[PDB]
Amino acid sequence: ASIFRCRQCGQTISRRDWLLPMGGDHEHVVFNPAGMIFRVWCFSLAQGLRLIGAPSGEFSWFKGYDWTIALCGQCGSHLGWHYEGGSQPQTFFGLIKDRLAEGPA
Ligand SMILES: O=C1CCCC(=O)N1
Ligand SMILES: [Zn+2]
């Protein structure tokens, strides 16, 4: 139970080892302006995504960070967001936990 793959297609995305406690916890439950609730797990690093558009600071859940939508690079499923432009760390990923599948390396 140590790597996270895309739930829809199996693309390798991240590792348990790369979980990042932002503000004291790797899990953040949040809502967007359309009222969709996401349970976000923060990772310092990820792979197999495709980051879309240019970063935006609008409604950022994490102070001082701008976001870009992160899709699965294989299937296009929306897996979370890349955050940049902040400090300690400058960048990280916030991935939607129920859109990933955890399993053996
Ligand atoms: O409200 C939102 C949607 C996109 C990601 C974020 O930080 N905030
Ligand atoms: Zn996928």
Coordinates of C-alpha atoms in Angstrom, one line a residue, residues 1-4 15-17 102-105:
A1 CA 0.0 0.0 0.0
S2 CA 2.5 2.6 -1.0
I3 CA 1.8 4.1 -4.4
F4 CA -1.2 6.1 -5.6
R15 CA 3.6 7.8 -3.3
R16 CA 2.6 7.7 0.4
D17 CA 6.2 8.6 1.2
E102 CA -3.5 3.0 -3.3
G103 CA -1.6 -0.2 -3.7
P104 CA 1.8 -2.1 -3.9
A105 CA 4.9 -0.6 -5.6

